[PDB]
Structures are given as structure tokens and as C-alpha cells.
Amino acid sequence: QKPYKETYGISHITRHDMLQIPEQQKNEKYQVPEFDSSTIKNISSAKGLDVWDSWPLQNADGTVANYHGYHIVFALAGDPKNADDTSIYMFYQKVGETSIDSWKNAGRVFKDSDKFDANDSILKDQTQEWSGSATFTSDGKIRLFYTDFSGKHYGKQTLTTAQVNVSASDSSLNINGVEDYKSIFDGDGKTYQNVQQFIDEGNYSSGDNHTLRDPHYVEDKGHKYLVFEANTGTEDGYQGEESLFNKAYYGKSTSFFRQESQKLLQSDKKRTAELANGALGMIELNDDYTLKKVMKPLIASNTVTDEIARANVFKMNGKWYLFTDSRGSKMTIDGITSNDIYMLGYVSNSLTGPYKPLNKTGLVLKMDLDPNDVTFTYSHFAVPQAKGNNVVITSYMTNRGFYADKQSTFAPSFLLNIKGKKTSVVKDSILEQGQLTVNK
Ligand SMILES: OC[C@H]1O[C@H](OC[C@H]2O[C@H](O[C@]3(CO)O[C@H](CO)[C@@H](O)[C@@H]3O)[C@H](O)[C@@H](O)[C@@H]2O)[C@H](O)[C@@H](O)[C@H]1O
Ligand SMILES: [Ca+2]
């Protein structure tokens, strides 16, 4: 195939930028801080469950919501013995509290019957509830977005919404049920990959990784959007053999393209790179949270990785910041190892772009601890704050199903300083486990 260059009018995680990361990540500015294992507790209210991917109830701008005097955190939880047991639980604390022990458990958001009662063809085939976001509406409602995963339909993933009805008293919160529970988006083929395209490849045994998940709600000027983990479609730079010849995915220069493309073509990562077409996608919603418009991706990762997770985006001090979590084990970049775990970050003057890499390369956070390390963390999430130059980084701590006595839990939070197009971890800024805000 002949070399070409096509950006599709979107931003790209380039091979050249990613290659700079192995050397750059040695700087403590970009490193998840060391945690103290003897301070680490299981979520007392979770009662023997693994609790991993979590997200706070947020105001439209991403700041932590105050629901009737409480903070609310939604989290994936399930049986450590069953990797396919994943449901969304709702945890809550009184505003002002910081202890991990302050987090009470309201239980599952959903009843098993809810997906059937929803009168929603896709939802009644759901087998697992995967990550998303939650916004606190202007009329005081808890508005959840999450991933409908269907194990029965070859791992179909559908962006889904529901309103969570919650009674509040001086002592407790209680989930009464849900309403407006509906599928929003399952891909369109042209802009974002759908499950049929995955099945076209031969699903799981093809080596392809189909994703359409981790939706993050955000507003700008009263317009409503979800930014989410996805993969490109046929019209915005699809996976395939031809993709390795697109200079937009390499960057730097034709000299670098020539050298890097030929190396990749001769490597054992050729097929992996061909299949890699991860994207951070965007859709606009209507005021009833239905689909208004499929939009172009904010960024894509063709050749680099098929998996850029937990999309997060917010405006802070005049600039827009876009983050994603990603595993080095799924990348094709020399120098990046199977131990390496990242939060990558991008910056723009506008929500819809264009986005340029945060610390020249995209590196914001690096974690490389052994999967066996009790203080291992993943799923790092930047929580925007009402004021100041710091965001709070949350993550989950222990690997799922690894230890009988130590479950996946809220990691100790820490501070990330953000100014202009640069970030640095704040020295000795470790907070409580699952702490959402600096202010108390
Ligand atoms: O697709 C095959 C893969 O499926 C399952 O893992 C899916 C996915 O899980 C994690 O992604 C996040 C971030 O932590 O976790 C939830 C799901 O639990 C997702 O909404 C979110 O993106 C991992 O980080 C990913 O690497 C992984 O692909 C299953 O658990 C795997 O064993 C495997 O079968
Ligand atoms: Ca792919």
C-alpha cells in the first residue's frame, strides 16, 4: 500500500508522542504516588464485594454535586469469585465527612426486573452494567449514564441512561427505583464501531476489541453531551491493513513515518496495530437525554491501542481538559511495557477541540506496580474542583479477585495541579480513600 495522510478533521494520539513517554515517565511529576498499604481498608459497607470503577454525582461542569446534604458515588461492584458479575452500586456520605468508613451503601441502582420494565429491546438482553457518569440536573434529579453490556450478543455495549429516584432524610439515602431508563446509542458504523462490525471480524477470536462505554456527561452553553470510550467507524479512519500507512497516526515527519511504519510492519505487533482504532467519541443529547447528534471523535488512537478508557472532560480556568485511562499491555509502542498504566491528557480552548497533548506527549499519570501489589491502582479519574489549580485524582486500589481478605476498594485520592498545557502531581497530597473534594 502507498503512504498517505488523512486526519479526518480530528485529533490523534500519535506514535511519535507515545514513544517519548518511556523516558518522560521517570519524572515524578507524572507518577501516581506511592501508597501506604497499612492504611488501606475495604469499603466497610460493601460487605465482601470488589468495588472498582467509580464516579461521583457531578454538577454539569463536573464539580462534585451536593444531594440533600450528601455526596454520592456510583461504583462497579460484584463477587470477587465471578469476573462477569458487575452491577452499579450507589455509595453516599454526608458532606464534610472524609473517612472511607463514612461511605454508606444504598445498594444496587437497578432491580433485575428494571431492564424488562424499561420496554427497551437492547436493555432486556443486558447481562452486565459497566461504567459511566452521573449528573445532578437543574430540577434536582439524579441522572445516570452507564454501559449496557450484553454477554448474549457478543459483548454488545450500549450507552444507556436512567433517572435514579432517591429519598433523603437526616440519617440515610434510599433508592426507591428508576425511571426514564433507556438505550441512547449503540454505534452507527460510520463514525463509531458497532457490535455487528465486531461480529463481522469473528468477534473475540479475531483479536479485535470492540468498545462503546464509559460515557461522561458534560455541558457547554446549555448543550448536553456524552464523551465516551469507542472505536472509529468506516468514515473516520477505520481499523485495517491500510491504516498503518496513514502518516497522521505517526506524526513528526515523513522520515519518522518511513522508519516507524517499516519497523511496525516487520514486528509482532503488526496485527495488533492494524486492529487498534480506539477513540474518544462524542454525541449531543436532547433535553430528555435522547440522541440529538452523532459527532466526530475528539481524539483517536489508530495503530497505538484499541482501548482508551474512562473518557473524562471538563473546563477548568478557561481551558478544556480531556483525559483517558489506558493499559500499556494493549499498546504497540516500543519502551512501553505490560506493567505500564496511564492516564493520558489533552487540552483545548473549546470543548469540541482541537485537542493537543498535555505535557507535550499526552502523559499525565503513570502507574507501573506489579498486578499483585496491594497498592496497585487503575481507572484514575480527575475530579474538577469549584476553584483553584488542583483536581482530585480518584482511582480504585486492589486488583479484582486477587486477595481473599483485600478487595478492590477506593484508593487514597491525591492532587493533580493543572495550569495551561502542563500538569504535575502535588507533592505529598495523599487524601483519604475515595475522597472527592479538597474542601471539607
Ligand atoms: O473485552 C474482553 C474483556 O472484557 C472484560 O473487561 C472489559 C474491560 O474492563 C476494564 O475496563 C473498565 C475500566 O477499568 O472497567 C469496566 C468494566 O468492568 C469498563 O466499563 C471500563 O472501561 C479493563 O480496564 C479493560 O482492559 C477491559 O477490556 C473482562 O473483565 C476481561 O477479562 C476481558 O474478557
Ligand atoms: Ca479495533
Swiss-Prot record:
GO aspect biological process, one term: carbohydrate utilization
Effect in UniProt of substituting residue 328 to F: Drastic decrease in catalytic efficiency. Reduces affinity for sucrose. Synthesizes mainly oligosaccharides, but can still catalyze the synthesis of low amounts of levan
Single GO cellular component term: extracellular region
Site feature location: Transition state stabilizer: 214
Main location: secreted
UniProt effect for mutating residue 327 to K: Decrease in catalytic efficiency. Reduces affinity for sucrose. Synthesizes mainly oligosaccharides, but can still catalyze the synthesis of low amounts of levan
Protein keywords: Calcium, Carbohydrate metabolism, Glycosyltransferase, Metal-binding, Secreted, Signal, Transferase
Subcellular localization(s) per the UniProt record: Secreted
Binding site for sucrose: 52-53, 131, 213-214, 307, 327
Effect after changing residue 84 to A: 2-fold decrease in catalytic efficiency. Synthesizes a bimodal levan molecular weight distribution
Residues reported to bind Ca(2+): 208, 239, 275, 277, 306
Resulting phenotype, residue 149 to W: 2.1-fold decrease in catalytic efficiency. Synthesizes a bimodal levan molecular weight distribution
SUPFAM superfamilies in alphabetical order: Arabinanase/levansucrase/invertase
Complex and partners: Monomer.
Family: Belongs to the glycosyl hydrolase 68 family.
Function summary: Catalyzes the synthesis of levan, a fructose polymer, by transferring the fructosyl moiety from sucrose to a growing acceptor molecule. Also displays sucrose hydrolase activity. At low sucrose concentrations, functions as an hydrolase with water as acceptor, whereas at higher substrate concentrations it adds fructosyl units to a growing levan chain.
Listed name of the protein: Levansucrase
Organism (species): Bacillus subtilis (strain 168)
Gene: sacB
